[PDB]
């Protein structure tokens, strides 16, 4: 027994291999891909599910990290979260039809409302504003840069367009006089 | 007619025109001058990725 | 700009009907006296075929070229709507199955509040 | 009748020969040019892969006005493209609020069967 | 059976300010082609 740049090895894949189990347990929604905090809003949505809503709050401000960050003792999950996900899937041609029913609503829902826009205005044009600031000045660099480069080449361009007016002007006096 | 006249048809300057806190139509106004915006800029990158270059081969 | 035989720029430019494309002078006349051929398609093509009125014109600029640009504005915004509309037929599809796991997991929520407080219920009892 | 990128009636149809969809010349090409795929179904496919596939002439009215018609028209593209993005933009914020609740009600379950693991023990007792 | 144009950096415009001296220079050309 003589190891030899195998317990490094070792070290190094049982570190590769606790990272994988953190890095897959740590969120679900976190991991895959994309929130102000408020705890305001956690207290005004209490009167909802009204269970539900106050453990997917609480949730959603521990992942997140007027913030206060209180429990990581949630998130060992990996083997609970694993049979969870399988008694669940068991309790779940027709299923599919009401999915999609139910979809053709929500769509409907979704072009009712934004219908009926097009409080609400102030943050509109305060966004334009924020885009008129960052765009304009901008487009005032990209103009002014373009503009110390392609003025002197516009010149360069437009007196050598009055060339051919005269070059036509006096084409026609010679051609006549031809 | 236009040209007897010697007058022009006028255009909408209606979005250089909008302003803050106003009704639902001018709400219509501000959302257009973001998509504006949009396109001005995505139109200046475009020229900037070009360069000069394009202006020297014409 | 460029003569498509030798890759200079004419000085003399005869453009040819047979196949459009802009020929030097001196070198598409000895490409003739060769072969009567034009050099590209390989048609014939006769010196005589080969040639160098009063509207005045002017110069490329940013009405046709305007009309040809607005084409580009929109056929460029008409991708812009693909790239939303096919997302949003992967988000709601998502978003079904969601709300369906979810509609069908509460029901099972519902029945443990139920059955771990009623076995509370009925052992604190006995 | 629509192509099936911009929804235009094509003026130069061409169809796809690894899916079936009738595309219009210039905006598959620009798919094309960009990635080698196809839009609907990501087949690899390319531009000599294309097979270039009811005209009826719009008369308007009885030429100024013409012009504000123009101009009221590119107002409102670019409004019923604008709405569509915040929409798409809402819909996957409001599909994400969703997937945090679906994951913190699974871990919800792992305590309630405790209790009841807990209480089926005192029940044998 | 390629010619380039560099549009301007100001390019809004070409809806109101391009589209109208175009059709003025037309306008305006042809009538006084026809005075001529």
Redesign the interface.
């Known amino acids: 027994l003589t190891p030899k740049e195998l317990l490094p090895h070792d070290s190094g894949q049982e570190d590769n291999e606790r990272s994988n189990i953190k890095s897959g347990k740590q969120?679900?929604?976190r991991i895959?891909k994309?929130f102000a905090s408020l705890p305001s809003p956690k207290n005004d949505f209490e009167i909802l599910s009204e269970d539900?809503?106050e453990?997917?709050a609480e949730?959603?401000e521990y992942?997140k990290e007027e913030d206060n960050f209180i429990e990581p003792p949630?998130?060992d999950?990996p083997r609970?979260?694993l049979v969870?996900?399988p008694?669940?899937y068991s309790?779940?041609k027709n299923?599919p039809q009401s999915?999609?029913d139910?979809?053709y609503n929500?769509?409907v829902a979704?072009?009712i409302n934004?219908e009926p826009?097009?409080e609400s205005?102030?943050q509109?044009?305060t966004?334009?504003?924020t885009?008129?600031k960052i765009?304009?000045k901008?487009?005032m660099p990209?103009?002014e840069?373009?503009?110390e480069?392609?003025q002197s080449?516009?010149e360069s361009?437009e007196q050598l367009?009055r060339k051919?007016?005269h070059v036509?002007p006096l084409e026609?006096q010679n051609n006549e006089m031809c | 007619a236009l040209y007897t006249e010697y007058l022009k048809q006028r255009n909408n300057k209606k979005r250089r025109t909008p302003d803050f806190n106003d009704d639902d139509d001018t709400l219509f106004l501000e959302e257009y001058r973001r998509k504006y915006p949009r396109i001005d800029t995505s139109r200046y990158i475009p020229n900037e990725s070009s360069e000069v270059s394009l202006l020297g081969i014409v | 700009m460029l003569c498509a035989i030798s890759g200079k720029v004419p000085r003399r430019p005869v453009l040819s009907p047979k196949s459009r494309t802009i020929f030097e002078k001196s070198l598409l006349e000895q490409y003739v006296k060769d072969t009567g051929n034009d050099p590209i398609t390989n048609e014939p093509l006769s010196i005589e075929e080969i040639v160098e009125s009063a509207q005045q014109a002017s110069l490329t600029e940013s009405i046709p070229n305007l009309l040809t640009s607005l084409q580009n504005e929109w056929d460029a915004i008409m991708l812009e709507n693909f790239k939303l509309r096919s997302t949003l037929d992967s988000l709601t599809k998502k978003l079904s199955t969601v709300m369906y796991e979810r509609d069908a997991a509460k029901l099972v929520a519902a029945q443990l509040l139920m059955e771990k407080n009623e076995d509370s219920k009925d052992l604190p009892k006995s």
């Open positions: 969120l679900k929604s895959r994309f539900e809503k453990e997917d949730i959603a992942e949630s998130q999950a609970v979260s969870a996900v008694l669940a309790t779940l299923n999915a999609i139910n979809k929500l769509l979704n072009a934004k826009h097009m205005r102030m509109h044009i966004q334009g504003r885009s008129m765009q304009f901008t487009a990209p103009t840069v373009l503009l480069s392609i080449k516009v361009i367009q051919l007016q036509q026609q």
